[PDB]
Amino acid sequence: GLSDGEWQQVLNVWGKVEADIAGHGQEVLIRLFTGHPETLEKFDKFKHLKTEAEMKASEDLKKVGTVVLTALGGILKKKGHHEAELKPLAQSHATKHKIPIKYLEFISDAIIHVLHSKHPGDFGADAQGAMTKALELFRNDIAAKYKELGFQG
Ligand code: HEM
Numbered sequence: 001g002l003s004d005g006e007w008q009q010v011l012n013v014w015g016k017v018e019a020d021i022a023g024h025g026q027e028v029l030i031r032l033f034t035g036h037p038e039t040l041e042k043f044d045k046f047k048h049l050k051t052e053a054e055m056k057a058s059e060d061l062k063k064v065g066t067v068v069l070t071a072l073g074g075i076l077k078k079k080g081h082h083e084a085e086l087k088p089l090a091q092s093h094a095t096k097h098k099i100p101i102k103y104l105e106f107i108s109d110a111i112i113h114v115l116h117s118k119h120p121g122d123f124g125a126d127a128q129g130a131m132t133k134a135l136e137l138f139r140n141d142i143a144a145k146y147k148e149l150g151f152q153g
């Protein structure tokens with residue numbers, strides 16, 4: 001797993017996110033949909049959107065990004081002990097919405113990019129390696145649940 005130091009650095013930068021969660025949700029999702037447009041097809045409410053200006057104007061997108069970052073903060077705050085938090089998330093991402101593990105890799109990279117961009121002072125090298133590991137652990141444990149659920153992610 002991660003060390004105490006690695007978790008502490010994860011949780012430090014997450015406090016920056018939580019100081020404006022909607023702002024962060026919007027930029028992560030815009031980074032995701034612009035880098036990997038096939039991911040936007042997953043979101044029926046706003047898959048019709050084409051430009052970053054449309055994306056920024058969208059209340060629905062802002063709302064979903066807040067829900068996503070809020071849930072990830074919940075997981076992260078457990079520092080690995082996130083069975084209860086991961087369970088319903090694996091379940092909906094393997095059944096209701098079928099989210100490939102590759103797309104979880106894209107949004108992880110989007111998070112890391114947005115954090116480096118907005119919080120260089122709380123996100124230098126060590127901190128980046130630690131968030132890298134925390135999101136790898138998240139994706140690996142979600143994959144293990146996907147298998148159980150009958151979804152080849
Ligand atoms: C950091 C990784 C992610 C976290 C913590 C996360 C979390 C969540 C949460 C808490 C919800 C709402 C409740 C639920 O259905 O369980 C949600 C909904 C959703 N997520 Fe995920 N998510 C992640 C990544 C992704 C990715 C990469 C995609 C698609 C490429 C995606 C697609 C969806 C869709 C389509 C919904 C339904 C949204 C709606 O209400 O219109 N998620 N996610």
Ligand code: NA
Nearest residue numbers: 001002079080
């Ligand atoms: Na531990």
